[PDB]
């Protein structure tokens, strides 16, 4: 956690 990547878009939520 904290990191989500989808469609090449990285998203570090927490």
Beta bridge partners of 11: 4
Using CA atoms, how far residue 8 sits from 3, 12, 13, in Å, is 12, 13, 15
Residues with Cβ < 8 Å from 9, sequence gap 6 or more? Answer: none
Query: How many Å from the N-terminal Cα to the C-terminal Cα in the chain?
Result: 6
Print burial letters for 2-14: b (CB count within 10 Å at least 16), e (below 16).
eeeeeeeeeeeee
d(CA 2, CA 8): 15
Which pair of structure tokens corresponds to residue 13? 């939520």
Which pair of structure tokens corresponds to residue 12? 């570090």
Residue 13, SS3? Answer: coil
Residue 6, SS3? Answer: strand
């Amino acid at each position: 956690r904290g990191k989500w990547t989808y469609n090449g878009i990285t998203y570090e939520g927490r």
